[PDB]
Every structure is written in structure tokens, then in C-alpha cells.
């Protein structure tokens, strides 16, 4: 099965096949940057002791990619006092194929996990900066994302500040898509953490 749950930076620091699996997971993760610290949280997608996907959440009131890294691109945008930014979206397509089989909608499942996690954490939406390629993916996912601002990273590189909705309609929308694509039990997409049969 595929387990999607969240862990804190502190848990990743403060802490047989268990220790080993955890070490393999850590060795497969995204290398740190200025924002990995107390307060930061991560959703991990794990199967058979291996990391198939992950995404990082940072509070909007703490240093993040919108306010720091890409400050010059979005400084005209006013952000809410309370909120979360998702970054470092990660899906190992090669490894997911091996463990979850080809055609498993691992990306849609992580989107669902983000919504389910957000509801469990009192966030009605998630802010994020994505590449043009990722914007195309999100747009095709059906998730009713909203572009707040399109920016030019470079002359030919466009990036976008978006809000990702995490309301009940979104949870049912993403959940319904996952159910019909994997045939998993309907109740499996309604919880947090998530446990999906593969």
C-alpha cells in the first residue's frame, strides 16, 4: 500500500527494517535550503520503505519562496497574515512506476493529500509558485487552481503564484478522480493520513 502522511522538521531531526527504511527515505529526499527548519512540515508518500513523493509546507508568516527567493517577482501581491506555502513538490516517477505500477496517478494522489492535510490544519487554500510546466499539469488535473500572478523568472521562463483550493468540493473532486482511476475503496480518499491500496 501507499502511505501519505505528514512529518515535522523537528521529527525529522529529533528522530530493524524501521531505522533502515527511514534512512533510505531520508537519502531519497530533496536537499535542504534556507527554509527547512522548525515550523516546516512535509507530506511524505511512502511504499515499501521508499519515498515516492513529497511536498513541503511553510507558514506564510515565516521566510518562504514567495516573500524571499522570488520577492522581486511578487512583491506587489499582498498575502494573508495566516496561511501556508507549498514548495519542493516531488514525485519520483521512475520509482513510483516500479512500486505502484505504471499509470498509477501518484501526482493526483499527492494533490489529494495536500487538500486533506490542509483541512486537517485549518488552511482553506494553499499558496505556491510553480513553473509553466507544472501549471499545465495542475490545470489538466481538474483542481480549480487560481493564478494570482504570472511572472517572468527570465526572458523565456515564466513562473506563477497560485492559490490551490482545499475546500470540501476540492477534496471530493480530487478524491473522486483518484477513486475512479484506481478503484480504491471510496472511504480511502476521505482520511488524513491517507492509506491507499496499490
Q: Identify the sign of the CA torsion 100, 167, 79, 150.
A: positive
Q: Which of 9, 47, 15, 16 is nearest to 30 (CA)?
A: 9
Domain spans, the chain: 1-198
C-alpha cell at 96: 513510483
15 Cβ contact list (under 8 Å, min separation 6): 22
Quick one: cell of 185? 475503496
From which experimental method does this structure derive? X-ray
Q: φ, ψ for residue 56 (rounded to 5)?
A: -110, 140
Q: Which of 110, 182, 102 is closest to 141 using CA atoms?
A: 110
Distance CA 89, CA 98 (A): 20
Superfamily grouping for domain 1-198: Gcn5-related N-acetyltransferase (GNAT) (3.40.630.30)
The H or E element containing residue 115 is helix 106-120
Q: Which residue has the cell 486537517?
A: 120
User: How many other CB atoms sit within 10 Å of the CB of residue 91?
Assistant: 16
Helix (H, G, I), strand (E, B), or coil: what is residue 166? coil
Which resolution, in Å, applies to this structure? 1.8
Number of continuous H segments (helices) and E segments (strands) in the chain: 7, 8
Please give the torsion angle defined by the CA atoms of residues 71, 12, 1 and 114, in that order, rounded to the nearest 10 degrees: -30
**Residues 68, 154, 85, CA angle at the centre, nearest 5°?**
35
Angle subtended at Cα 24 by Cα 22 and Cα 29, rounded to the nearest 5 degrees:
95
DSSP 3-state of 29: coil
Which H helix or E strand runs over 134? Answer: helix 132-141
177-187 burial code (b ≥16 CB/10 A, e <16): bbbeebebeee
Amino acid at each position: 500500500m501507499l502511505e501519505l502522511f505528514d512529518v515535522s522538521y523537528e521529527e525529522l531531526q529529533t528522530t530493524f527494517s524501521d531505522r533502515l527504511g527511514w534512512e533510505v527515505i531520508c537519502s531519497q529526499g530533496m536537499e535542504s535550503d534556507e527554509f527547512d527548519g522548525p515550523g516546516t512540515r512535509y507530506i511524505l508518500g511512502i511504499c515499501e520503505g521508499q519515498l515516492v513523493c513529497s511536498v513541503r509546507f511553510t507558514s506564510l508568516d515565516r521566510p518562504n519562496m514567495i516573500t524571499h527567493t522570488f520577492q522581486h517577482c511578487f512583491s506587489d501581491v499582498t498575502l494573508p497574515a495566516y496561511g501556508t506555502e507549498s514548495s519542493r513538490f516531488f514525485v519520483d516517477k521512475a520509482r513510483a512506476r516500479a512500486l505502484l505500477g505504471e499509470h498509477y496517478p501518484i501526482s493526483q494522489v499527492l494533490f489529494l493529500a495536500m487538500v486533506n492535510w490542509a483541512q486537517n490544519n485549518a488552511y482553506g487554500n494553499i499558496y505556491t509558485i510553480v513553473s509553466r510546466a507544472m501549471l499545465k499539469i495542475l490545470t489538466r488535473s481538474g483542481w480549480q487552481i487560481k493564478v494570482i500572478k504570472e511572472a517572468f523568472l527570465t526572458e523565456k521562463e515564466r513562473i506563477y503564484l497560485l492559490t490551490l483550493p482545499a475546500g470540501q468540493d476540492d477534496k471530493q473532486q480530487l478524491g473522486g478522480d483518484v477513486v475512479s482511476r484506481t478503484g480504491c475503496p471510496p472511504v480511502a480518499v476521505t482520511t488524513w493520513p491517507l492509506t491507499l491500496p496499490v
